[PDB]
């Protein structure tokens with residue numbers, strides 16, 4: 346059980362070493378999670394037009410093998426854990442360019458639900474719609 | 485007269501060809517203009533904390549020679565044109581070293597002034613500040 | 620008639636800035652993504668040469684922004700051939716919010732074909748495979 | 760002692776939430792480490808023009824409070840450890856916009872020293888120049904008081 350985001354690696358993704366610069370693997374976490382939100386949490390998305398902000402509280406990534414321009418990466422997001430305030434998502438990154446998929450990296454991101462206020466951010470509980478949509482991607 | 489922004493070219497700035505990916509030259513236009521606002525237009529920057537949004541209406545850039553990681557680029561901003569609503573900035577990009585500065589790129593950006601968008605006229609403080617860099 | 624090659628993108632939070640719209644350089648990044656997908660699909664021998672000494676480098680670009688894009692919009696980037704000379708290719712881009720289609724931006728990029736030679740990048744004739752593939756997206 | 764990278768936060772650094780998009784904190788790790796190489800490890804930089812590639816093997820960051828456009832961030836790098844071919848750097852991020860530093864984030868990155876071969880990356884020993892340079896930013900010994 347995972348939510349998948351596929352990405353053709355661009356020239357912009359690369360750096361002078363010839364591989365994908367490491368921060369792009371973290372960017373794909375947000376792209377993957379945002380696609381999940383659009384497809385599975387429409388009410389939460391509507392609240393993010395008013396005052397609701399989902400913000401990263403931590404993230405991590407481990408890099409096992411290089412990706413190159415014109416590789417295709419499959420980013421697979423699953424639920425590591427959830428409580429009343431925060432969500433931890435796990436990510437596996439597969440090269441799917443040709444042949445069976447090969448794991449090239451792993452990572453994680455924890456997000457907190459907050460209200461946007463003038464003087465900072467106000468933690469709130471995970472919206473029910475989000476919790477329900479995420480329980481499908483659990484172990 | 486020009487307003488100068490300097491940047492050590494990072495690994496992230498590069499791509500697999502080995503040079504600076506073209507969009508970063510445009511990014512530096514914003515970084516340069518921001519530095520200008522902070523130093524020269526505090527009232528306008530203050531309004532930009534509230535409802536004033538300076539939005540790009542067009543940009544361009546010409547790339548004459550490569551930049552590489554660990555080069556230092558000097559981005560030099562001048563005023564190309566201004567009317568009641570919009571501002572066009574010119575940018576020259578120099579590779580700087582202990583030798584003579586070498587022109588590697590040149591570009592332009594036009595910004596419109598808006599309130600969150602509703603167009604509004606260029607703030608006076610901003611017009612005054614920019615004329616210091618007019619031809 | 621002129622055909623276009625389409626690249627679609629779901630606008631991400633990373634694409635946005637504090638104003639809430641898409642930061643302007645991303646429209647230019649989409650020109651590269653769109654062109655690089657065209658190459659993969661339409662010019663394989665050229666791509667293979669790009670594993671060696673062939674480097675396609677931007678010589679100029681431009682974009683003009685008509686209406687805002689926001690996170691979770693989908694943009695359709697439509698690329699056509701504006702012109703080709705011996706060493707250089709100019710591609711035109713129209714950007715539409717789709718997420719009928721509503722025009723939001725329009726831009727251009729010129730790319731030089733080069734080989735990385737002893738004394739720097741050196742312009743080279745547009746490879747025949749790439750000339751022929753691009754011609755499918757030129758005026759009729 | 761730390762190695763400092765200072766950055767004026769740009770509009771490009773921000774996102775719709777109004778704060779700095781989280782990946783930029785990681786990008787500053789690279790920019791900081793690069794500036795360190797440019798100032799402190801010229802032989803290593805020269806060999807990187809040959810075949811030496813320093814590649815990220817892991818990274819992490821935790822975000823305690825927001826940064827906004829026109830903030831100035833102080834990114835402070837220290838050496839956590841070195842193990843044969845890998846260097847682990849620690850980063851603390853401070854808002855310094857209005858004078859007194861305030862902690863806003865903390866992270867870490869491990870880099871592997873490698874040589875590029877036709878068949879891929881091969882780990883190689885950390886260059887002495889780099890080891891010595893980074894040791895200037897290593898904390899004093901701090902050992903458990905635990906009799907065995």
Ligand SMILES: CCCCCCCCCCCC(=O)SCCNC(=O)CCNC(=O)[C@H](O)C(C)(C)COP(=O)(O)OP(=O)(O)OC[C@H]1O[C@@H](n2cnc3c(N)ncnc32)[C@H](O)[C@@H]1OP(=O)(O)O
Nearest residue numbers: 365366367408409410411448789792813814815816871880
């Ligand atoms: C001052 C500084 C200046 C600063 C320096 C510059 C600052 C940063 C600049 C930007 C640079 C980048 O963006 S570089 C782009 C991002 N990074 C990458 O692309 C690096 C990708 N990783 C790799 O190429 C490689 O893993 C290396 C080279 C890091 C390590 O080589 P290796 O030791 O031969 O590799 P390998 O055995 O396969 O993998 C390492 C370990 O990963 C784990 N591992 C591997 N495969 C798997 C797997 N399928 N499932 C689980 N775990 C796995 C195992 O523990 C394995 O150890 P064991 O099981 O063998 O014991």
Ligand SMILES: CCCCCCCCCCCC(=O)SCCNC(=O)CCNC(=O)[C@H](O)C(C)(C)COP(=O)(O)OP(=O)(O)OC[C@H]1O[C@@H](n2cnc3c(N)ncnc32)[C@H](O)[C@@H]1OP(=O)(O)O
Nearest residue numbers: 504505506547548549550587651654675676677678731740
């Ligand atoms: C479908 C496709 C797939 C799509 C392809 C893939 C999509 C893009 C992927 C991203 C790629 C990048 O980001 S590449 C990174 C960004 N681009 C660059 O770094 C390229 C830098 N530019 C250059 O290296 C060069 O200009 C070249 C190689 C492009 C052109 O070579 P050239 O024609 O031999 O160069 P040169 O004569 O020295 O100068 C170029 C021209 O610039 C002008 N010029 C030069 N210097 C000056 C100067 N100081 N002041 C004024 N003008 C000057 C003159 O017109 C000059 O022509 P003349 O007066 O001398 O006759």
Ligand SMILES: [K+]
Nearest residue numbers: 375631632633
């Ligand atoms: K994102």
Ligand SMILES: [K+]
Nearest residue numbers: 514769770771
């Ligand atoms: K900017």
Ligand SMILES: [K+]
Nearest residue numbers: 355356357651
């Ligand atoms: K690209």
Ligand SMILES: [K+]
Nearest residue numbers: 495496789790
């Ligand atoms: K970097």
